[PDB]
């Protein structure tokens, strides 16, 4: 209980996960100093919900979940309650009563590659919207029309996962961003 939280292996992890396959680290029975995170110019985004971001140190919860993934800058605004879009609807949904924080930083120097990176993907199509904290990693062909595909792609039959193609020369709004979502239950 008197030990440090393993935030270092979370924020400074060598490799992050794709947003559709977002990873979760369970964190309990630890004490952290959230003031050095809020004070960090390294973090491009530090937005908390249901709890003051300037007074995080004076709180206690039973468990802490640390969800992390990679999106592009223009999509960081979707990592918030009540948001809509490709990421919010098809990749990572936060609840309206979400109690936690959303942290993100530019990761162009790590996750961009000249010619376009192929490792990070996002879900482009889905029949229905994701429930809050739902995880969908299926690779079924999306039937956009009324005629059934049969595992073959084509007209109105599209693979559901698409590569971001992160390039260092991209506009910053298209450069890769590493996100960390802290929730307190």
């Amino acid at each position, epitope marked *: 209980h008197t030990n440090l939280c393993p935030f270092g292996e979370v924020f400074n992890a060598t490799r992050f996960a794709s947003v559709y396959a977002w990873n979760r680290k369970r964190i309990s029975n630890c004490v952290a100093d959230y003031s050095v995170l809020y004070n960090s110019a390294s973090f491009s985004t530090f937005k908390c919900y249901g709890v003051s971001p300037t007074k995080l140190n004076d709180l206690c919860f039973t468990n802490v979940y640390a969800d992390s993934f990679v999106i592009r800058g223009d999509e960081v605004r979707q990592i918030a309650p009540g948001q809509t879009g490709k990421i919010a609807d098809y990749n990572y949904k936060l609840p309206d009563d979400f109690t936690g924080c959303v942290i993100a930083w530019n990761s162009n120097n790590l996750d961009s590659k*000249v*010619g376009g990176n*192929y490792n990070y993907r996002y879900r482009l199509f889905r029949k229905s919207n994701l429930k809050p904290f739902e995880r969908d990693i299926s690779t079924e062909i999306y039937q956009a029309g009324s005629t059934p595909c049969n595992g073959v792609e084509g007209f109105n039959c599209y693979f559901p996962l698409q590569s971001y193609g992160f390039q260092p020369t991209n506009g910053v709004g298209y450069q890769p961003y590493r996100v960390v979502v802290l929730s307190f239950e």
Partner: antibody
Amino acid sequence: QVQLVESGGGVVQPGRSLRLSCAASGFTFNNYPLHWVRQAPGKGPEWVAVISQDGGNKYYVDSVKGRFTISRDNSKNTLYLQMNNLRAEDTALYYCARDVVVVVAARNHYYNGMDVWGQGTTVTVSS
Amino acid sequence: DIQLTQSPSSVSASVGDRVTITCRASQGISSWLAWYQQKPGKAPKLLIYAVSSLQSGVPSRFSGSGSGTDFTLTISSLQPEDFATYYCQQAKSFPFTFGPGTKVEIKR
């Protein structure tokens, strides 16, 4: 057959110029970036330059920056390397190579290596 | 520039051996690494790209692994046509840089 054939090498005094050409066949030429790789006698390969599909992008090793210019003729399936102000340490065998394109979910990703190589053409900078 | 080192410098092997070559990058390059083979008087031949993707026609006895700064090329059972120099190449950023090479030699 997928093939690249270099030409234009020779002996050149220091400070003078040479122009190398690369003849391609057996693949859709305009769909691929192309590289220039050189290899001095007894040493490993050294990447020199690359040009994009349409020729809009060009990148160079610092050793040749401002002296070499890479270009292509998509109507002629030919890649070039204009070598100006040649120094002794430019002596090497010059290959042209096709870019390795990585496809994920039907999307192309470029600059992942060099798969198709030519036999090389030798330039020798000496007085 | 991204630096690349290879180990060992040379390997003395026999037909049937399990040869493993390593490649180290001065900074992380994720999966953006390729392996080339070169015999005297020939252009390099691409064997592996994206760390672990076999080039078309390359025998399956060639394998690749690694991520970030450390990478491995493994030949399960060496065949007489495998004695050559092997290079690793990073593809994170220009300039593309090669490793010093590892020569696979015939033991006797």
